[PDB]
Structures are given as structure tokens and as C-alpha cells.
Amino acid sequence: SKLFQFKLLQSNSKLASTLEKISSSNKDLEDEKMKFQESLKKVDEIKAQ
Amino acid sequence: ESINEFKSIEIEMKNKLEKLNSLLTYIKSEITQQEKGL
Amino acid sequence: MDIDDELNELETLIKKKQDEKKSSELELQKLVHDLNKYKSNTNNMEKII
């Protein structure tokens, strides 16, 4: 049971690390979406030109 | 600029797929922690 | 001259269409990269059977 508790703590740490990685990936995706919106605004400016 | 925007949209779709895979893996790892109560 | 221009325009449109197809090609693999894999997962379940 002590070994199972240790394994559960390790699994919780791994899940926290995976959640942090997923949060960083979501932040990168949001930055990419903002860059795409800026590119769309530049395309609209080019259409006006 | 339009070609670059299309490439950026494709890269964003790939990154979103990777993030969805990572989120599914994290959800599986969190669901695998049900035995922590015992 | 007019005819030439028209032809060029058509070609341009065709090019754009091809580009779209290329994007679809990515999708044509992306979900597929998991889709059959999902079936493979079911195959693992079949092993349990």
C-alpha cells in the first residue's frame, strides 16, 4: 500500500507535468492564432491597397 | 502574404492536433489516478 | 491580349484550387493518422477478446 501510494504520487506529478505541457502548447496555439489574425489584418490592408 | 497565412494556418492546425493529443494523454493519466484513494 | 489575360486568370484560380487540395491532403492524413490508429486500439481490445 505504501508502494501504491508512492506510485500514485508519481502519477500525480506526471499528470501535473503533462498539464503544464498542455498549457504551454495551448499558449503557443493562441500565439499562433494571434499571428494568423495579424496576417489576416495585413491581407485586408493589402486588399485596400 | 496570403501563402504565408495559409502556411501559418496549416501550422496552427498541426499544433492544435498535437495539443489535443497531449490533452487526451493528460486526461488519460489523470483518469489513471483513481487508485490513489485506496 | 484580352484572351491571354483571361487564360492567366483561369490558371491563377486553378493554382489556388490546387493549394486548397494540398491543405485537404494534410487533413486527409491528419485524422487518418489517428483514425486507423483508433482501429488499432480496437484491435488491442480484440486481443482482450
Curated annotation (Swiss-Prot), chain A:
Name the UniProt record assigns to this protein: Structural maintenance of chromosomes protein 4
Other remarks on this protein: Present with 573 molecules/cell in log phase SD medium.
Protein family according to the UniProt entry: Belongs to the SMC family. SMC4 subfamily.
Notes on the domains: The flexible SMC hinge domain, which separates the large intramolecular coiled coil regions, allows the heterodimerization with SMC2, forming a V-shaped heterodimer.
Record note on quaternary structure: Forms a heterodimer with SMC2. Component of the condensin complex, which contains the SMC2 and SMC4 heterodimer, and three non SMC subunits that probably regulate the complex: BRN1, YCS4 and YCG1/YCS5.
Localization in the cell: Nucleus; Cytoplasm; Chromosome
Full protein segment contained here: 393 to 441 of 1418
Taxonomic placement: Eukaryota, Fungi, Dikarya, Ascomycota, Saccharomycotina
Function summary: Central component of the condensin complex, a complex required for conversion of interphase chromatin into mitotic-like condense chromosomes. The condensin complex probably introduces positive supercoils into relaxed DNA in the presence of type I topoisomerases and converts nicked DNA into positive knotted forms in the presence of type II topoisomerases.
UniProtKB/Swiss-Prot annotation, chain B:
Localization terms from the record: Nucleus; Cytoplasm; Chromosome
Top-level taxon: Eukaryota
Function noted in UniProt: Central component of the condensin complex, a complex required for conversion of interphase chromatin into mitotic-like condense chromosomes. The condensin complex probably introduces positive supercoils into relaxed DNA in the presence of type I topoisomerases and converts nicked DNA into positive knotted forms in the presence of type II topoisomerases.
Similarity remark: Belongs to the SMC family. SMC4 subfamily.
Miscellaneous remark of the record: Present with 573 molecules/cell in log phase SD medium.
Subunit structure comment from the entry: Forms a heterodimer with SMC2. Component of the condensin complex, which contains the SMC2 and SMC4 heterodimer, and three non SMC subunits that probably regulate the complex: BRN1, YCS4 and YCG1/YCS5.
Domain notes per entry: The flexible SMC hinge domain, which separates the large intramolecular coiled coil regions, allows the heterodimerization with SMC2, forming a V-shaped heterodimer.
Descriptive protein name: Structural maintenance of chromosomes protein 4
Parent-record interval covered: 1077 to 1114 of 1418
UniProtKB/Swiss-Prot annotation, chain C:
Transmembrane segment boundaries: none
Domain of life the protein comes from: Eukaryota
Compartments, as annotated in UniProt: Nucleus; Cytoplasm; Chromosome
Oligomer and partners: Forms a heterodimer with SMC4. Component of the condensin complex, which contains the SMC2 and SMC4 heterodimer, and three non SMC subunits that probably regulate the complex: BRN1, YCS4 and YCG1/YCS5.
Domain remark from Swiss-Prot or TrEMBL: The flexible SMC hinge domain, which separates the large intramolecular coiled coil regions, allows the heterodimerization with SMC4, forming a V-shaped heterodimer.
Extra remark beyond the main annotation: Present with 3290 molecules/cell in log phase SD medium.
Protein family: Belongs to the SMC family. SMC2 subfamily.
Protein function: Central component of the condensin complex, a complex required for conversion of interphase chromatin into mitotic-like condense chromosomes. The condensin complex probably introduces positive supercoils into relaxed DNA in the presence of type I topoisomerases and converts nicked DNA into positive knotted forms in the presence of type II topoisomerases.
Protein name: Structural maintenance of chromosomes protein 2
Organism: Saccharomyces cerevisiae (strain ATCC 204508 / S288c) (Baker's yeast)
Lineage: Eukaryota, Fungi, Dikarya, Ascomycota, Saccharomycotina
Span of the entire protein shown here: 885 to 933 of 1170
